[PDB]
Design a protein around this ligand. Structure first.
Ligand SMILES: *[C@@H]1O[C@H](CO)[C@@H](O)[C@H](O)[C@H]1NC(C)=O
Ligand SMILES: *[C@@H]1O[C@H](CO)[C@@H](O)[C@H](O)[C@H]1NC(C)=O
Ligand SMILES: *[C@@H]1O[C@H](CO)[C@@H](O)[C@H](O)[C@H]1NC(C)=O
Ligand SMILES: *[C@@H]1O[C@H](CO)[C@@H](O)[C@H](O)[C@H]1NC(C)=O
Ligand SMILES: *[C@@H]1O[C@H](CO)[C@@H](O)[C@H](O)[C@H]1NC(C)=O
Ligand SMILES: *[C@@H]1O[C@H](CO)[C@@H](O)[C@H](O)[C@H]1NC(C)=O
Ligand SMILES: *[C@@H]1O[C@H](CO)[C@@H](O)[C@H](O)[C@H]1NC(C)=O
Ligand SMILES: *[C@@H]1O[C@H](CO)[C@@H](O)[C@H](O)[C@H]1NC(C)=O
Ligand SMILES: *[C@@H]1O[C@H](CO)[C@@H](O)[C@H](O)[C@H]1NC(C)=O
Lengths: 314, 168, 314, 168, 314, 168
C-alpha cells in the first residue's frame, strides 16, 4: 500500500520566507481592493451637509438654515459646501472642523445679549433670504445712523450648563477706511475677549480685497470653548459681529469628506472620499487616508496567504 | 522541512479529490484509492484556525486628520504626511513578513501532517511490510481488501500475519 | 519500557498561531497590570512643585519663592499648582513647560537693567507676601506719579554664558483704558524685542475681563532662548514688566504630572499620573501616556506566554 | 508538529513530578517511573532562554508630550492622539503576533524534544525490542532493573541481548 | 558508511529566539555602518547653494544672484548660507524651506506692478553689488523726498498660469520712529493682503534692535501660494517692500543639509549631513534623520544574520 | 529541532571543505570522504533565497522634517522627535525579532536537511545495514568502493546484497 497527498492542475503561487512563487493548492487574499462607490450608512443617523459648510452650522448662512441644530452619528462634508455667505474665513478652522465632526451634532442656546444706542441688524445682499439678510446666529453691530460713533460696550456670558459652550464671534474688515467710519465711526477699534483659559486681543484692518461674491470686505470668525461655570467677556468698541446663540456638543459622531451618494442598504464602518471599504481582511490598498474602523493600509496590491499544501504535480 | 511532501514522495494525486492525504493500493483483488480523514481534517482545522486568527476587524476608530477640500497648513501637513508614510512603511513590512512566515509554517505544517500519517502506518505494520522510500509499504503477505481497510481504519493487527511475512 | 511526558490537572490556556485556548503546563504574563499608587523616587533628586506652577519658577509668584533656583532629576507638577499670582497667561506655554521639565533645574542670574525717571516697583494685593507685592523675578514698570507719561526706553542684555538664557517679559493689559493712562500715560504703547533669531512686535489691549482673584486685568508673559554671545533688546514705551533675572538650564531631568504621594522606598523609571509602573515585562496595559523608561502600551489586558509543553491529561 | 506529544502518545503522566519527560517500565521485578534529565533540562533551558529574551527593559526614555492639567491646543492635540493611537495599534499587533508565534514554537519545541528522546531510545535498542506505536518499546529479553537503568543511563549494549531477543 | 556535516575552526556567534551567542558557520551583517563622507550625486541635477540661503533664492540677496531661477533634482543647503542681506527674517520659514526643497527649482515671472508718486528703488550698504543695492526680486517702497508722505495704494496680481504662484512681500521695521517717518512719513501704516484662501492683516513696529551687519532695522518677509485664476491684493500705505517677480515650482526634487563635498563619481539615494549611505541592507545605524530612500534606522550597532548551519567543532 | 545536527551526530568535519553535508566511509579498500551535492545545494538555495528576501531597497522616499542649521519651533520639534523616537523603537524591535526568528529557522532548517539526507540513506539500505546512532550505517556485507559510490549516487540496490547481509 502506498501513501500520498492531493494536487491540482492549476495552483496559486505565494511567497514564503525563502522563495518567491511557491505554487500551493489553495490561497486567499489578505489585502482588500474592492471598493463600494457609495457611503454605506445603514442604521446610522446621517447628515449630508451638501451645500452647507460644517463651520457654517455654527454661524448660519442661508445654505445652513436647516443644519443649525443637527444630530448625527455620521457627518458628511461635500465639496460644494460653503461656511460663509458674506466673504470671510475662520481662525483655527481645521481644529474647529475636527471638533464638530465628532460632536454628535450641535445644540443652540440663546446667550441673551442686550444692547442700547446701537444698530444690531446689519444685512447684506450676499446673504439672501427674503431680501438682504445676515448670519442667523450672529448680529452685525453697526451704528445708529449713516455715521455717528460706536459706544464701547462690555458683554458677558456665563455658560450655565455642564458642557463646554462653543463661542463664535466675528470682526468685520471693510473694503476701505471710509466704509469702516460709515459703519462704526472714526477711530481705531478693538475687541477683547476674556475668560479663565483664553486671552486676546484682536483689531480690525480695513482695506480693498478681491471681489468675492461682488464684495471687497471680509469677516474674521473666531471661537473658543467656554468651560462650565466660566464666563466669556467681550469688551469692544467697533467692527464687532456678536454671537446671538452658543453651541453645545450633543455627543459623539463620525466625520468624513466624500463625493459619492449615500446608501442605506449597505452597512460600513470604514469610509474614504470614494466610498466605503466593506471587508474582513486585515489590510487594504484602497486609500491611506481612510477613516473609521479600517484595515491597515499597505503599499502592496496583493498578498496571497497559503491555505493548502504545496502543489506538486507530475 | 519534514521531507515527506515535495519530498521523497514524487508528486501528488490529482485524482484524490476526496481529501488532502490518502492511501492508494494495488493487491490481488485490484487497485483502489481512499482519503485519510483524520490527517486531512487536522490540517484543515489548523490552517482554517490560522485564517480565522488573521481575519479580524480593527475595532479601533481613527478620525480625519487632514482635509481633502481645503488643505491644512503646510508645516503640520508635512508632519502629518511624514507620520502617515512612516506608519505605512511599518504596516507594509508587517504584512509582508506576516504573510511570508504564515505561508512557510503552513507548507511545513502540511508536510508534517503527511509525515505523521506515514509514520503511523509504519507503526501499524511492524515486520509484516518493508518501506520502499517513495511512500509505499511493500507487503509480504496477501493483504486482502479487508486487510487494506483495516490498515486505513487503524485496526490492522501486527501479529495476525507476522510469521507469514517474516520469512519473505 | 514506555516513554512519556508530564501533565497537570489544571493547566493554563494560551493562544497560538492556529488555535485560541491551548492548555499548556505553565505560562506567564507579558502585559503588566500591577500599579504602585505612588511616585517611586528612591535615589533621585525630586522636586514636588505642589502649589507652585512650573512656569512660575521663572517669574516667581509668592507660591514659588522656594523654587526659584531648584535642581532635580525628577520634577512633579501638581493639579493645585499655579503659574501666576496676578491674573495672566504664558504665550507658548506648553513648549516652555517641556523645556523646563527636562532642564535639570534653573539657575538665576541678574540681568542688570537700570532705569531713570520711572517707577520700577509696582505691586498688587493678589501677590501677597508681607503686603502687596509682585513677581520676585519681574519689575512692573509704571510712571513716576498717578499719571504723567512713560519715556520710551531701550534696554539690552548680552548672555555672557556658554548656555542659552531663558528670557521672560510681561505686558500688562489693564481693566480699561483709563487705568492704562493712570499707570503708563495716554497714547498707544509698544514693546519690541530683537536679537539674531527672534523678531517681534507686541502691543497691549486694555479692556474689562473676568474678575479672576478679584481683578479684571491680565498680564501676558513671553519668552525666548538667547544664544551665547547674543544680545536681547527691549525697546518699549509703556505697559512693560521687565525681567530682573534670567534663567539658565542646569542639565537634564524628568518631568511628570501626578496626584499621588512621593515614596523614597521604591525605585522606578516609568511614571504616570496614578503612580509608578515597576515591571520587567515588555508590555503594559495601565496608561498609554506613561512616560520615562516604560514597557510599550498595548490594548490587550493579558497575553499569556507558554513556558511549558501542552497539557494532555487523561 | 513532530507527532510525539498530543501525539501518538495518549496523554501525560500526572505522577511524573520529577521532570518533563521520563520512562515508566513494567518488568519481571515490578513497575517503576523515573525522569529523563537531559531532555527536560534541554527544553527548560531553551524555553527559559526565550523568556529571558522577551523579558527586557526599554532603556529608551520618552518625555511628556501632552498636558493632563491644562489641555494643549486642539489641532496639535489631535495630531498627538492620532500618532499615539497608531503606535498603540502597531504595538498591540506586535505583542499579539509575538506571543502567538512564541507559543507555537514552544509547544512544537517540547514535542520535538519528546520525539528526540524516543528516537534516542530507539537508537539504543536495535533489534532487541520492537516499538508498539504508543511510546513503548516491547522487549524480547528479560530486561533486568539494571538493564532498564542502563537504558535510562544510555549505557545499554545492543549486542549483549541481541540473539537472545532476535528469535522472538 | 557514516554521514555528517561540515564545520569551521572559527565561526560567528549570532542570536536566536532562545539563545544569545550561537556559533554558526557563516553570517552576514544586516545593519549598515559604512558611510561615504561626501554627497554622491552621479546622474542628478545638483545645486549646491553654498553661501546662498534657500529662501534667498526667492528674494534675491547678492549671494543668491546666480540662484534666482535654478533647476535641480537635488538641493544642498550649507551652514554658511544666508537668506538675507539686510537684517530680517521669514514668517513660516521652515514650511517655505520644505516647499522649496521638493520644488524642482523655481521659475521667476514679472508681476507688473506700476507705481506713481513714490520712490521704488530703496537701497542699503548691507546689500552690496556695484554699490548700495537691494533684493533683486523686491522693491523697497519709500517716499519721494527726505520725508513727505506715503499715498495709500492697492495693487493686484492675477496668477495667469496653471501652477500656484509663490508670493513674497516684505515689511520694514526701522530702527526707530523718526526713521519710519523719514522713509514713509508720519502716521501708523498698514499692509493688507487678500485673495480667496488668505486673510491678513500686518502692521509695522519701529524700534531699536541689535546691530546685525551694523544696522538696527529689520525686514519681515511673508509669503502665500496663489492658486491659478486667483488674485492677490496688497492694500498698503507705508513700510512696504513689494514683490517684483513671482515664483513658480518647476517640478520635484530632493533637499538635504550637508557639510561634505559633492561627488559625481558615486551614486546614492540616501543622504545625511555627514555624507551618503550606499547600502542594500534593510537597516542602518548611521543617522536617524537620514532622508531619501534609506534603510530603516535602528538603535543596534550590529545584527548578524545566520547564513549557515550551527558550527559544532570537536 | 530535528535532532540530527548538534545533535546525535557528535560534531562536524573540518576536513569536509567540499560541501555542507557528506559521507565518510571506512571499508576493506580504505577510507574516503565526499560531499553530498543535493542536500548542500538545497540548504544553500533556501538560505540564499532568505538573504535575497531580506536584502531589499526601500523605494519609499522620506523628506527632511527637521532643520539642522536653524532649529524649528520647540513644540513641533518635540512632537517630531517624539514620533521619530517611537518609530525608531518599532524598527529596532522589528529588526531584533526578525534576525532572531530567521536565525532560528535557519539553524533548524540545516538540521532538517541533514536529517533528510540521513533518512534517505536509511531508505536505500533496507535490511543490508543497521544504524548505529551516531550517523553511521553499519554494513553487514562487503560494500565495495563502487557500492559506496552507488550509495552516494542513490543507485544502491537493496536486493543485491540482501540475503548476504540478513544472516549477520
Ligand atoms: C480555497 O480558499 C478560498 C478562500 O476564501 C475558499 O473560499 C475556498 O473554499 C477554498 N477551497 C478549498 C478547496 O479549500
Ligand atoms: C457649577 O455651578 C452650579 C451652580 O452655580 C453648581 O451647582 C455646580 O456644582 C457647579 N459645577 C462645577 C463643576 O463647578
Ligand atoms: C500629503 O499627501 C497628499 C497626497 O495623498 C497631498 O495631496 C498633500 O498635498 C500632502 N500634504 C502636503 C502638506 O503637501
Ligand atoms: C511557572 O511559570 C512561573 C512564571 O514566573 C514561574 O515563576 C514558575 O516557577 C513556573 N513553574 C514551573 C513548574 O515551571
Ligand atoms: C563668546 O565670547 C567670548 C568672549 O566675548 C569668547 O571667549 C568665546 O569664545 C565666545 N564663544 C562663542 C561660541 O562665540
Ligand atoms: C486625547 O485623548 C485623551 C484621552 O486619553 C483626551 O482626554 C484628550 O482630550 C484627547 N485630545 C484632544 C485634543 O481631544
Ligand atoms: C559567507 O557570507 C558572506 C556574506 O556576504 C558571503 O560573502 C560569503 O560568500 C559567504 N561564504 C560562505 C562560504 O558561505
Ligand atoms: C483659468 O482661466 C483661463 C482663462 O481665464 C481658462 O482658460 C482656464 O480654463 C481656467 N482654469 C481654471 C482651473 O479655472
Ligand atoms: C531633537 O533631537 C535632536 C538630536 O538628534 C536635538 O538636537 C534637537 O534639539 C531635538 N529637538 C528639540 C526640539 O529639542
Amino acid at each position: 500500500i502506498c501513501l500520498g497527498h492531493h494536487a491540482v492542475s492549476n495552483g496559486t503561487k505565494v511567497n514564503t520566507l525563502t522563495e518567491r512563487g511557491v505554487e500551493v493548492v489553495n490561497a486567499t487574499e489578505t489585502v482588500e481592493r474592492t471598493n463600494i462607490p457609495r457611503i454605506c450608512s445603514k442604521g446610522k443617523r446621517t447628515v449630508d451637509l451638501g451645500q452647507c459648510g460644517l463651520l457654517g452650522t455654527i454661524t448660519g448662512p442661508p445654505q445652513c438654515d436647516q443644519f443649525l441644530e443637527f444630530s448625527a452619528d455620521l457627518i458628511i462634508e461635500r465639496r460644494e459646501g460653503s461656511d460663509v455667505c458674506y466673504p470671510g474665513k475662520f481662525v483655527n478652522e481645521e481644529a474647529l472642523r475636527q471638533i464638530l465632526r465628532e460632536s454628535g451634532g450641535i445644540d443652540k442656546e440663546a446667550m441673551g445679549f442686550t444692547y442700547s444706542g446701537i444698530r444690531t441688524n446689519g444685512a447684506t445682499s450676499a446673504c439672501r433670504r427674503s431680501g438682504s439678510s445676515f448670519y442667523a446666529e450672529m448680529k452685525w453691530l453697526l451704528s445708529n445712523t449713516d455715521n455717528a460713533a460706536f459706544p464701547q460696550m462690555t458683554k458677558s456670558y456665563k455658560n450655565t450648563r455642564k458642557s463646554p459652550a462653543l463661542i463664535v464671534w466675528g470682526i468685520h474688515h471693510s473694503g476701505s477706511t471710509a466704509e469702516q467710519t460709515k459703519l462704526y465711526g472714526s477711530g481705531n477699534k478693538l475687541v477683547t475677549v476674556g475668560s479663565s483659559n483664553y486671552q486676546q486681543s484682536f483689531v480690525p484692518s480695513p482695506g480693498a480685497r478681491t471681489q468675492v461674491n461682488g464684495l471687497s470686505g471680509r469677516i474674521d470668525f473666531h471661537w473658543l470653548m467656554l468651560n462650565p461655570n466660566d464666563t466669556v467677556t467681550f469688551s469692544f468698541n467697533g467692527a464687532f459681529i456678536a454671537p446671538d446663540r452658543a453651541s453645545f456638543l450633543r455627543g459623539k459622531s463620525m466625520g468624513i469628506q466624500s463625493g459619492v451618494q449615500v446608501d442605506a442598504n449597505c452597512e460600513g464602518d470604514c469610509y474614504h472620499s470614494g466610498g466605503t471599504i466593506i471587508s474582513n481582511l486585515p489590510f487594504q490598498n484602497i486609500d491611506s487616508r481612510a477613516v473609521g474602523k479600517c484595515p491597515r493600509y499597505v503599499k502592496q496590491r496583493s498578498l496571497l496567504l497559503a491555505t493548502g499544501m504545496k502543489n506538486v504535480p507530475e | 522541512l519534514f521531507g515527506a511532501i515535495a519530498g521523497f514522495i514524487e508528486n501528488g494525486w490529482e485524482g484524490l479529490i476526496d481529501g488532502w492525504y490518502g492511501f492508494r493500493h494495488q493487491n490481488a483483488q485490484g487497485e483502489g484509492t481512499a482519503a485519510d480523514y483524520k490527517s486531512t481534517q487536522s490540517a484543515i482545522d489548523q490552517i482554517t484556525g490560522k485564517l480565522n486568527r488573521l481575519i479580524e476587524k480593527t475595532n479601533q476608530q481613527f478620525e480625519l486628520i487632514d482635509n481633502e477640500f481645503n488643505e491644512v497648513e503646510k508645516q503640520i501637513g508635512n508632519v502629518i504626511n511624514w507620520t502617515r508614510d512612516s506608519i505605512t512603511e511599518v504596516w507594509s513590512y508587517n504584512a509582508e513578513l506576516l504573510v511570508a512566515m504564515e505561508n512557510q509554517h503552513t507548507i511545513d505544517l502540511a508536510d508534517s501532517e503527511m509525515d505523521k500519517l506515514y509514520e503511523r502506518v509504519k507503526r501499524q505494520l511492524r515486520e509484516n511490510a518493508e518501506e520502499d522510500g517513495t511512500g509505499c509499504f511493500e507487503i509480504f503477505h496477501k493483504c486482502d481488501d479487508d486487510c487494506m481497510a483495516s490498515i486505513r481504519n487503524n485496526t490492522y493487527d501486527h501479529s495476525k500475519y507476522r510469521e507469514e511475512a517474516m520469512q519473505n
